[PDB]
Amino acid sequence: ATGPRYKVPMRRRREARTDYHQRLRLLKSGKPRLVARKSNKHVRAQLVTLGPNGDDTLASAHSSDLAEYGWEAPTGNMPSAYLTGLLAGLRAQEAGVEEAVLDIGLNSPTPGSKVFAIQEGAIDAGLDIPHNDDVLADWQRTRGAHIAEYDEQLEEPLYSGDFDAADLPEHFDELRETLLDGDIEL
Amino acid sequence: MHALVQLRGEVNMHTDIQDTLEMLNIHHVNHCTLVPETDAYRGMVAKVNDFVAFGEPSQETLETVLATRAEPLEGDADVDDEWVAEHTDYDDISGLAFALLSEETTLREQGLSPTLRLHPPRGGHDGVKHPVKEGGQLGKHDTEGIDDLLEAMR
Amino acid sequence: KPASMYRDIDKPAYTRREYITGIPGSKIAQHKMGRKQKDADDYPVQISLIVEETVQLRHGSLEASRLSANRHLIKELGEEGDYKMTLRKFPHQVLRENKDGMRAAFGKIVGTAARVQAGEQLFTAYCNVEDAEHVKEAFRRAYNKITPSCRIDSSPAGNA
Amino acid sequence: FHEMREPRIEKVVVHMGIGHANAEDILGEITGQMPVRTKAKRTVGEFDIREGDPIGAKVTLRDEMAEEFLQTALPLAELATSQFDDTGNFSFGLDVTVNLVRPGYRVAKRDKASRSIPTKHRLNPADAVAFIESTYDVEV
Amino acid sequence: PSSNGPLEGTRGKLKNKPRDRGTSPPQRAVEEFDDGEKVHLKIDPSVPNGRFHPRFDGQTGTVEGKQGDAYKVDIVDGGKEKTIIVTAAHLRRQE
RNA sequence: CCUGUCAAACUCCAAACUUACAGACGCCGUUUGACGCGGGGAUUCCGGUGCGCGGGGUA
RNA sequence: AGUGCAAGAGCAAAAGAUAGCUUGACAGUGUUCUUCCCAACGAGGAACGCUGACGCGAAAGCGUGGUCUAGCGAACCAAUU
RNA sequence: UUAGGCGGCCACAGCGGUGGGGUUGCCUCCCGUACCCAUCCCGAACACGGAAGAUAAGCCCACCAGCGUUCCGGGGAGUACUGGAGUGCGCGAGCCUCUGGGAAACCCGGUUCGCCGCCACC
Ligand SMILES: [Cl-]
Ligand SMILES: [Cl-]
Ligand SMILES: [Mg+2]
Ligand SMILES: [Mg+2]
Ligand SMILES: [Mg+2]
Ligand SMILES: [Mg+2]
Ligand SMILES: [Mg+2]
Ligand SMILES: [Mg+2]
Ligand SMILES: [Mg+2]
Ligand code: NA
Ligand code: NA
Ligand code: NA
Ligand code: NA
Ligand SMILES: [Sr+2]
Ligand SMILES: [Sr+2]
Ligand SMILES: [Sr+2]
Ligand SMILES: [Sr+2]
Ligand SMILES: [Sr+2]
Ligand SMILES: [Sr+2]
Ligand SMILES: [Sr+2]
Structure with missing residues (x-):
């Protein structure tokens, strides 16, 4: 911008959306990337592969299409993230994808976080992904227990649109139950 | 040409x-x-x-030079209309001269040096x-x- | 020392001060003469001294010619005459001399010169239609103190 | 339009630039939360050749902690127009700095797709003196 | 030359054009080539490792295999056949 | 702002040209066997001149 | 700017800074280039592998010393494992 | 792509500026700290939980060329420089002719306020 000699960062760098150094180390595996992302309200998991004119998403799942299988709960929590990973994972298996490397983009590797939940979900779907068990939240938290107890400290329902009062991780179970099943229209 | x-x-x-x-x-x-x-x-x-x-x-010039200095790929056989006719895809020197100038063939192609x-x-x-x-x-x-x-x- | 020793451009450009030390000071006292508070546009006449051959002019020569030129313009128009003259070239080329046979011959630094391509303006004066013949005479004296032949070219001045 | 534009306090940073500390204790009481050590850079003739080593302390307050502090702190100063930043900030004094900004300032503080705040959304000295003065005190 | 190290006289060829300065895009550092493919050799100033001898810059060789992630490229230096170990970052497909 | 100048160890630019590989044409090779490979025998390792480009040096 | 030291070159969510942890400045054996353009020549050097054992990291991955090009030494003999 | 994710090329994409856009949709800002996790001090950030409010930031859509950049026309310029050739010129440094190539600065007028790929989505 200042002159002929000025160096402008690559576009995805200005936009502060792509860590190119991590990207490179990621691509060095030769495997597909399980692109785990999250929004204030949603969570998205994509299986991306390298292409001539750009990346190629072979399969993917969004927390939105989770309802499509019987989900009346919010979509920005742990149970949401895990199930979304599993959904994307299952679809990945469908398209012939068998292994991946977790790409958490610009999110932090916080133990028990959602990007890791997406990963645990994707792994259960039968996908082979290099991981570390002691960095994944404990089963119960994945189910959504942590939020149930929070609702126990009631006085005012945690959720506005009455999905339920004391909330239900058992719903998480019903949905995972529905996904791990064969039938399911992926 | x-x-x-x-x-x-x-x-x-x-x-x-x-x-x-x-x-x-x-x-x-x-x-x-x-x-x-x-x-x-x-x-x-x-x-x-x-x-x-x-x-x-020019067509004429080429014709003069061919009649006077053209030679077979081998041998001393003089090159004239009869030679041209009995040895090339043409009837006489003119035919050859024309095809050369129009780049339709080459001396080698017609058995000429x-x-x-x-x-x-x-x-x-x-x-x-x-x-x-x-x-x-x-x-x-x-x-x-x-x-x-x-x-x-x- | 004879100018025959340096007048030609037969050597690489040698001007980098960061790699050369002991460079003698220039003898050129001024590059802008006459009334330097006024613009050259304010004059009806503009005459330049053009070098006819490519050459190198040692600073000692620029000073002698420039001096014998401006000196005349001062004696003829006054220490404050309504005119202005410029020496547009600066001696950037550092010169040597090998002053022990041809062994370790790289010379020591002895001076500076300005490279002037043929056809270029070395000097340029701006005067009034009156003092036009005085500047032409100042240049006649100047080109007598530099190596090449020169043309005294008159630019804006159709008062022939 | 005005709701997501009306100023607020991002942080109140109390700090004592000493030069060699034992002063942390008072800040810990006048503010309410733990202070932090301050290291210096570059060697200094004034017997300050040690690069990394305690020389000061500061406390950054946010939300209530910040307000509850200013309530009893602001009355201790005589604010002036000069004492204001070109960004809409002011510091008085033991130093007391007040960082003011508009709602979504996070856009420039987050890790993902962060972005610099447009000069239009940047607070102004004028818009700053107002908000503040418009709450328990006077200007110039 | 005054000295004979590997980087002797390589000021130009190993310097980046100002606007190409800075970490290079990962795509070409992960590119895959097949045996027999023609590849132009050119060191990328921004990439430290996987380089070949600067003297070879400008060669167009033939991939004949791999050694780890690096490629073994066949070239002819003058009249002498040589094998060069080089990473994708410093290679480009011909045509 | 305007106005006067530069760079063998400066470059936002930038040739001619040199150069890797390939295709085409040309030329050449498959009884004159090219290209390549193995082996025998050397001589040679004071050079010079013109032209082009030079670096040193007043030359 | 910094990055130990010439010069030229490389580097910005880093190759710089701070903090923490750690000993890969590791063992074995190669490929290739360099040394020595072309074109044979040793020591030395570098890039890139396989095997073993490890460090850190969620993991991809990084680590065969210091971002790159200087910091080096035959046979005989001695000491050492 | 009525606002999304991952990218390729890496300023034609930068700098600056104007206008437009969101009731259970999207992205955000935004609300809030029991948990996982977090600040050498701060739920600021990171992380988690969430919808009262908002389109003012961001973002997306439409657009402006003043600066920077890309390409194009016309002028500079077939100039500067240059591969091949010469019993051409010059005291000489050097120049010229023929043949084959051929700039840069700068001015003027246009272009450029990204293009493209995969996935998802009233
Ligand atoms: Cl994200
Ligand atoms: Cl090599
Ligand atoms: Mg015959
Ligand atoms: Mg050079
Ligand atoms: Mg001995
Ligand atoms: Mg010993
Ligand atoms: Mg608006
Ligand atoms: Mg004659
Ligand atoms: Mg003569
Ligand atoms: Na301290
Ligand atoms: Na680069
Ligand atoms: Na060796
Ligand atoms: Na907005
Ligand atoms: Sr000379
Ligand atoms: Sr003279
Ligand atoms: Sr050359
Ligand atoms: Sr290294
Ligand atoms: Sr907050
Ligand atoms: Sr003479
Ligand atoms: Sr032409």
Whole structure:
């Protein structure tokens, strides 16, 4: 911008959306990337592969299409993230994808976080992904227990649109139950 | 189709320039060859530009030179209409001359040596130290200029 | 030392001060003469001294010619005459001299010169239609102190 | 339009630039939360050749902690127009700096797709003196 | 030359054009080539490792295999056949 | 702002040209066997001149 | 800017800074280039592998010393494992 | 792509500026700290939980050329420089002719306020 000699960062760098150094180390595996992302309200998991004119998403799942299988709960929590990973994972298996490397983009590797939940979900779907068990939240938290107890400290329902009062991780179970099943229209 | 006549000897000429002439089948002073006007050949003549005289000859001129200096790929069999007719895809020299000028064939294709070994220019040439535009004999010529030279060397 | 020793451009450009030390100071006292508070546009006449050959002019020569030129313009128009003259070239080329046979010959630094391509303006004056003949005479004296032949070219001045 | 434009306090940073500390204790009481050590850079003739080593302390307050502090702190100063930043900030004094900004300032503080705040959304000295003065005190 | 190290006289060829300065895009550092493919050799100033001898810059060789992630490229230095170990970052497909 | 100048160890630019690989044409090779490979025998390792480009030096 | 030291070159969510942890400045054996353009020549050097054992990291991955090009030494003999 | 994710090329994409856009949709800002996790001090950030409010930031859509950049026309310029040739010129440094190539600065007028790929989505 200042002159002929000025160096402008690559576009995805200005936009502060792509860590190119991590990207490179990621691509060095030769495997597909399980692109785990999250929004204030949603969570998205994509299986991306390298292409001539750009990346190629072979399969993917969004927390939105989770309802499509019987989900009346919010979509920005742990149970949401895990199930979304599993959904994307299952679809990945469908398209012939068998292994991946977790790409958490610009999110932090916080133990028990959602990007890791997406990963645990994707792994259960039968996908082979290099991981570390002691960095994944404990089963119960994945189910959504942590939020149930929070609702126990009631006085005012945690959720506005009455999905339920004391909330239900058992719903998480019903949905995972529905996904791990064969039938399911992926 | 341009006619190429070497007018300057090999002593002291760049080797890559001398090899170019040889690739164009000329190995002696006063030897002439006919070259198609292709981009590849164009570069070649442009490279030998200072040691040769070239240009497009007239149908008649070509015919005179062929009758007088054309030779078989091998042997001393004189080349005349009968030779041409009994040995080529043409009826006489004119047919050959025309096909050559129109780049439809080559001397080799018709069993003739690629080279026309001309005679020294009767009455001498315009000198080999200057190009045509400066009164010399080197470089590209008019169809008339080339005809004058080729005929004096018939 | 004869200018025959340095007048030609037969050596690489040698001007890098960061790699050369002991460079003698220039003898050129001023590059802008006359009334330098005024613009050259304010004059009807503009005459330049043009060098006819490419050469190198040692600073000692620029000073002598420039001096014998401006000196005349001062004696003829006054220490404040309404005119202005410029020496547009600066001696950037450092010169040497090998002053022990041809062994370790790289010379020591002895001076500076300005490279002037043929056809260039070495000097340029701006005067009024009156003092036009005085500047032409100042240049006649100047080109007598530099190597090449010169042309005294008159630019804006159709008062012939 | 005005709701997501009306100023607020991002942080109140109390700090004592000493030069060699034992002063942390008072800040810990006048503010309410733990202070932090301050290291220096570059060697200094004034017997300050040690690069990394305690020289000061500061406390950054946000939300209530910040307000509850200013309530009893602001009355201790005589604010002036000069004492204001070109960004809409002011510091008085033991130093007391007040960082003011508009709602979504996070856009420039987050890790993902962060972005610099447009000059239009940047607070102004004028818009700053107002908000503040418009709450328990006077200007110039 | 005054010295004979590997980077002797390589000021130009190993310097980046100002605007190409900075970490290079990962795509060409992960590119895959097949045996027999023609590849132009050119060191990328921004990439430290996987380089070949600067003297070879400008060669167009033939991939004949791999050694780890690096490629073994066949070239002819003058009249001498040589094998060069080089990473994709410093290679480009011909045509 | 305007106005006067530069760079062998400066470069926002930038040739001619040199150069890797390939295709085409040319030339050449498959009884004159090219290209390549193995082996025998050397001589040679004071060079010079013109032209082009130089670096040193008043030359 | 910094990055130990010449010069030229490389580097910005880093190759720089701070903090923490750690000993890959590891063992075995190669490929290739360099040394020595072309074109044979040793020591030395570098890039890139396989095997073993490890460090850190969620993991991809990084680590065969210091971002790159200087910091080096035959046979005989001695000491050492 | 009525606002999304991962990218390729890496300023034609930068700098600056104007206008337009969102009731259970999207992205955000935004609300809030029991948990996982977090600040050498701060739920600021990171992380988690969430919808009262908002389109003012961001973002997306439409657009402006003043600066920077890309390409194009016309002029500079077939100039500067240059591969091949010469019993052409010059005391000489050097120049010229023929043949084959051929800039840069700068001015004027246009272009450029990204293009493209995969996935998802009233
Ligand atoms: Cl994200
Ligand atoms: Cl190599
Ligand atoms: Mg015969
Ligand atoms: Mg004559
Ligand atoms: Mg150079
Ligand atoms: Mg001994
Ligand atoms: Mg010992
Ligand atoms: Mg608006
Ligand atoms: Mg003469
Ligand atoms: Na401290
Ligand atoms: Na780069
Ligand atoms: Na060796
Ligand atoms: Na907005
Ligand atoms: Sr000389
Ligand atoms: Sr004279
Ligand atoms: Sr050369
Ligand atoms: Sr290294
Ligand atoms: Sr907050
Ligand atoms: Sr003389
Ligand atoms: Sr042309």
